[PDB]
């Protein structure tokens, strides 16, 4: 019995789209299907900047970021709890959320 009215993930008006390769299995999944998560993070990290700020010349400077847009196939994104089975009811919610924006004092 059909589970998601969206089937896989959003197509509707196509019949085709190029496939991407999972960033973990190196699998293969249509781009319409496939969990995608952006990933922006500082070159340095948590602790470093203090030795990174002290050891550097330059008066401040002020840190690059690495930017990487991830793709996972279903099994990887589940496996690693990027996404987690939600009850017959919760599945319907596209939305997104948490309560503060975890950036240093989160979990």
């Amino acid at each position: 019995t059909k589970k998601r009215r969206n089937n896989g993930r959003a197509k509707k008006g196509r019949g085709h789209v190029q496939p991407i390769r999972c960033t973990n299995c190196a699998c293969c999944v249509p781009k319409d299907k496939a969990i995608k998560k952006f990933v922006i993070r500082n070159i340095v990290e948590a602790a470093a900047v203090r030795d990174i700020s002290e050891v550097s010349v330059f008066d401040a400077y002020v840190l690059p970021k690495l930017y990487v847009k991830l793709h996972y196939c279903v099994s990887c994104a589940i496996h690693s709890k990027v996404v987690r089975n939600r009850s017959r009811e919760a599945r319907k919610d596209r939305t997104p959320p948490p309560r503060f924006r975890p950036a240093g004092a989160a979990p």
Partner: protein, 215 residues
């Protein structure tokens, strides 16, 4: 069998930047002691160092980089010339946001001194405040006319003027602003930079201009 640790043999040169930049003492670099069987200037001469325009100017030029290539050597001094401007990675990655149109135009053009350049520009549509569509794409018509405008300027702005004025130009970012003026009549746009410049063909030699620029 123990032998010839090599630094204890190597010699130092002070990398010198062109005049349009500001301060000009880039740093230092090591080559092997010249032996008749060798030209330390040989292993020295087409080297290219990439320095941040911020170190080069002193600033807001955090993003932006210049490639400086060693064009000749004079006793512990090595006089470099413009070789390129790119952006880095972080900056470029940071502009590229969903829900907005990314517009790129590039043109290849010969300068007043011969140099052949391929020179890129970039821009992104902007939502304007009392918008309440969340996205803010542009129409295909728009981008085609915007690109033409970017291209016309870039050829117009490089044809007249030598490698130095392009340089003098790219520092205060006058192209950027000019694009902004020619395009707002057509569609919003947030960001906008000539984002890269690629040296394609070099003219022949001439120490004359090089020194004019250094010295």
């Amino acid at each position: 069998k123990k032998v010839v640790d090599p630094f204890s043999k190597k010699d130092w040169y002070d990398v010198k930047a062109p005049a349009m930049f500001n301060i000009r003492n880039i740093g230092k670099t090591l080559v092997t002691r010249t032996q008749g069987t060798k030209i330390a200037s040989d292993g020295l001469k087409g080297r290219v160092f990439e320095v941040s325009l911020a170190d080069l100017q002193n600033d807001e030029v955090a993003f932006r980089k210049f490639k400086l290539i060693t064009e000749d050597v004079q006793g512990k001094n090595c006089l470099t010339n413009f070789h390129g401007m790119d952006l880095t990675r972080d900056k470029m990655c940071s502009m590229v946001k969903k829900w907005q149109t990314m517009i790129e135009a590039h043109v290849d053009v010969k300068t007043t001194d011969g140099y052949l350049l391929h020179l890129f520009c970039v821009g992104f549509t902007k939502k304007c405040n009392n918008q309440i569509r969340k996205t803010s794409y542009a129409q295909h018509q728009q981008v085609r006319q915007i690109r033409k405008k970017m291209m016309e300027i870039m050829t117009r702005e490089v044809q007249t003027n030598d490698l130095k004025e392009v340089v003098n130009k790219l520092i205060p970012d006058s192209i950027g602003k000019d694009i902004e003026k020619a395009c707002q009549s057509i569609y919003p746009l947030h960001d906008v930079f000539v984002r890269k410049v690629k040296m394609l063909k070099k003219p022949k030699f001439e120490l004359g201009k090089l020194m004019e620029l250094h010295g």
